[PDB]
Amino acid sequence: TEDHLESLICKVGEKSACSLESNLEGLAGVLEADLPNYKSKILRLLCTVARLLPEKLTIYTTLVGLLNARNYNFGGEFVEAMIRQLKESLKANNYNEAVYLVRFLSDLVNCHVIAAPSMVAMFENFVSVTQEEDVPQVRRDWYVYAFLSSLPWVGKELYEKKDAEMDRIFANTESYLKRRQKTHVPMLQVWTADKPHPQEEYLDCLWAQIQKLKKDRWQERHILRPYLAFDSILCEALQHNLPPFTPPPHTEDSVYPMPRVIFRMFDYTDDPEGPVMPGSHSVERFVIEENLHCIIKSHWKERKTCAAQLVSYPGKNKIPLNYHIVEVIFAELFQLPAPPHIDVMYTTLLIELCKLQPGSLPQVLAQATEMLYMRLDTMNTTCVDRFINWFSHHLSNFQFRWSWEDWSDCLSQDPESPKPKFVREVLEKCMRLSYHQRILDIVPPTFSALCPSNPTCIYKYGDESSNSLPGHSVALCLAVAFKSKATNDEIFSILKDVPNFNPLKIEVFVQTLLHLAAKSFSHSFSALAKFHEVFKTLAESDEGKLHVLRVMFEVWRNHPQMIAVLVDKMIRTQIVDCAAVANWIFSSELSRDFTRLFVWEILHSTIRKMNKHVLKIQKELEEAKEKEQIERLQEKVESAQSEQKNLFLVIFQRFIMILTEHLVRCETDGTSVLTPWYKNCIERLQQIFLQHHQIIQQYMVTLENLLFTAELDPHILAVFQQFCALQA
């Protein structure tokens, strides 16, 4: 039975033969009748949809309103229980859910369940948080956000009842907003350009939207309010006063949301014949996007349902829904530091959407793609990688069909420029999901030079090599020996005939082994597995490990995907370690490929494996806590935690070193600092922070004391300062 009511509450507002009003009133009557034996359950159930289905906010407040109208005491217990849940959500650092609870309490005012002065009082308290001393800006930010973002719903009523009080709250809010640090902004913007659309700090944007709403006398044109149909039933006589609410003090364990920048790509001129798009500074735009993001959050696991829910998103008036959907999806995908959900979901979601609205959505997506391409010049590198990975994957689902001619402007540009580079990287990704000649053929002849090279093996000692090369005879012996399926000892024996950690031994061995298993990943994998002993012996030192990577690259430089899987396999089987890979990434041999995606794909895959290894061992250790072992395993975790910390130390050190070298040389020569190479480098450093923020936060003291010091060149130090600002 308790499961039945949960179903009625959760499904109300969905597809129905009856009107929403009918079902709400009907549901109200059903819930009332079960108050005697299910009150406590119904309370919890309603408190739950309030925190979990914010997209359905006004449907549920209306329900609570009707319920309260039937039973005043119950409403009092609900409001009481909502305040409890809010305190608790705030305690568990679920500031996201807390916002929805505040919004619910806010809209309840409109339903006359809660008296307006109660929310005015609560908001006075939220805003006083900005007056607290020595607390993180992100803390003050959140209370201000929770307040302002509630106003599209309850602004009008609060202003009607307590205009003077509200004005004071706004005065205090604005003064807080004017003194906020904006240090985090550059690290979170998808584009740095101001045109055509500034990427606005979220509170600055929201404040501007609220000012517009105020100027419009708190009237907005989008929010559906089912309660307006029950005006006879709902009335002020049914209001409750809230118990005092004091925002829990900031502690050590308090975790506040990072600040955000508003993704913005469309305006009314992009759909010049449709319903006028709500402007960037309208609360309609804010609410639409917030709800759309909430819908994705509720249905991300089910792409078909997710697409359906987005396409059926209702609103008081006509809006260019397809634009809002596509815009919100790219807002998520390009969100910094990370999308709310796994990247690949967005790709398949857009495909579901295209299938669902075949006559309208594809045009918009194609228009959006053109615009993203045309704005590449100042797009942050992290977002460009996602754009590249998205677009290539998307193309592979539509027979790799694209009008490349639209992008001919990239052809005459510096190949290092964002546009031609994006194109080359996209074509490289396409090839990985296809075949070389196939991709060579999808582009116009004018683009042929941007196509990836045939991923062929390069064998140093092949039928063309001069027998004068060092170890040439041994290489041959190894070759024939490998065919005869020799044993490790047999190979060892041959290698001993090499003069000089023996770099030549490594070279003739790796070149020969890799060349012979060059047919497939599987062959290369089993070859590495078979002669593991040889690798471990030849690459026992750090120099050895680096030289293996170096020779491997000399062999497979035309095949980045092979390099990636080889590095990964070598790490997993300990032929090399992550420190060696990090050193290899920043090596002179990789200098000409340093800005390419594959390098960063490997670096991050390497970091991720290190992180997961730490988590894995930590888990085993914890598991033994519940059960000479538990302690001995504790040594493995400290070593892993050390390897991990050291990985980051090295990566940051290398970045500091090469950026300093560039910065120094630009001053010396009086040349421009801002080159394509620099754009990549600094944004790649930024990306280390963004992708691994949670892990890096434990190294803050060390990083600040050893590497990102006050004397560090400001271009570099700013990145660390921007990162710190994410939680300051």
């Binding site: 089910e302 990247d343 690949v344």
Partner: protein, 77 residues
């Protein structure tokens, strides 16, 4: 518990490299085995973590590889 998927409806020319590329979008792949012999248009994709296999089921399943709509399902039991 299972972290492995059967993949079906693959084109005859689809390679392990292409499967690596596509399926890596949902997570890190431990092993790929082409064919139906774990020791025809089928292959096995094993992930290190269950969450990654679930995301392949959610987002890779039902999309294209060599213009063919592939199908995935758990290799369990």
């Amino acid at each position: 518990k299972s972290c492995t998927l059967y993949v079906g409806n693959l084109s005859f020319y689809t390679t392990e490299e292409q499967i690596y590329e596509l399926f890596s979008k949902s997570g890190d792949i431990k092993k790929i085995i082409m064919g139906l012999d774990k020791m025809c248009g089928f292959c096995f994709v094993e992930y290190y973590s269950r969450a990654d296999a679930e995301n392949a089921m959610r987002y890779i399943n039902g999309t294209r590889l060599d213009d063919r709509i592939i199908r995935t399902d758990w290799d369990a039991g």
